[PDB]
Amino acid sequence: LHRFITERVVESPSAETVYNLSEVVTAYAEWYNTNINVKRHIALELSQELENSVLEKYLQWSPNKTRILKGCRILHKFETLQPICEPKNKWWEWSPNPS
Amino acid sequence: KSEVLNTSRLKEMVNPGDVTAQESFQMTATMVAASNYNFIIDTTDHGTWRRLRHYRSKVKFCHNPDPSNPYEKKEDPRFIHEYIMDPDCQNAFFSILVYFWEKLQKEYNGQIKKVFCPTIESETEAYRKSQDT
Numbered sequence: 001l002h003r004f005i006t007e008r009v010v011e012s013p014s015a016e017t018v019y020n021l022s023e024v025v026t027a028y029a030e031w032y033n034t035n036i037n038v039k040r041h042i043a044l045e046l047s048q049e050l051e052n053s054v055l056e057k058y059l060q061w062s063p064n065k066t067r068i069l070k071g072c073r074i075l076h077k078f079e080t081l082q083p084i085c086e087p088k089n090k091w092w093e094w095s096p097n098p099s
Numbered sequence: 100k101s102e103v104l105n106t107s108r109l110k111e112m113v114n115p116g117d118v119t120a121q122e123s124f125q126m127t128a129t130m131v132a133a134s135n136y137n138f139i140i141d142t143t144d145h146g147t148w149r150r151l152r153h154y155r156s157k158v159k160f161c162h163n164p165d166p167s168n169p170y171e172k173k174e175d176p177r178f179i180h181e182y183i184m185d186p187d188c189q190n191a192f193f194s195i196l197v198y199f200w201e202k203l204q205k206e207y208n209g210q211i212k213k214v215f216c217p218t219i220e221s222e223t224e225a226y227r228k229s230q231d232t
């Protein structure tokens with residue numbers, strides 16, 4: 001998930017919306033399917049590690065009491081930034097305490 | 100992971116009546132559930148959500164303690180790797196349980212619904228405010 005954040009989300013300068021909250025898990029599902037393996041996920045708990053991730057500082061709150069995003073961009077494909085030792089003959093001798 | 104709790108089977112694991120196997124028998128067992136992740140509840144009937152109790156742990160046991168935070172302390176894995184096989188610890192724990200049960204019997208006359216706890220039934224109702232999509 002951290003790799004997915006790095007690949008698909010880089011700090012947007014401005015002119016970018018909050019993308020709601022389901023976009024992260026929606027993109028992550030396809031990214032995981034196309035990168036590691038295909039398998040189902042449950043979107044409810046996948047949100048928590050987003051706060052546990054580096055996006056904690058950028059997970060803003062909403063007047064509707066929901067979680068929105070800030071300073072984010074939905075990147076895809078090839079998009080750019082868009083601004084010790086060895087003993088004499090007996091290792092089984094165990095050496096001194098450092099060994 | 101997180102799991103979904105089917106509304107089915109709840110009544111016969113919470114009820115004090117007889118339950119069948121199809122051999123029938125009276126079931127009486129205090130039931131406890133704990134997890135690192137959340138459950139899924141989809142119901143609002145007063146029959147359910149009333150025989151349910153919720154709590155959330157606040158402390159965190161980790162090897163490197165963080166000062167000035169009372170909600171974290173150094174863990175002692177020994178408590179798990181050993182301290183269970185000791186007969187003396189089990190005897191002390193059994194004494195604690197019997198003392199507490201006698202205290203409950205002499206105070207609330209064997210009724211668990213009479214006992215008072217502000218945090219309980221307050222965090223539980225807050226949880227009931229959740230799990231309603």
Ligand SMILES: Nc1ncnc2c1ncn2[C@@H]1O[C@H](COP(=O)(O)OP(=O)(O)O)[C@@H](O)[C@H]1O
Binds near residue numbers: 160
């Ligand atoms: N009061 C305490 N003092 C010191 N260490 C504790 C105390 N309570 C628990 N621990 C240690 O902290 C660890 C908690 O891990 P665990 O019980 O597996 O948590 P969880 O079940 O939530 O994963 C245990 O291994 C235990 O040895």
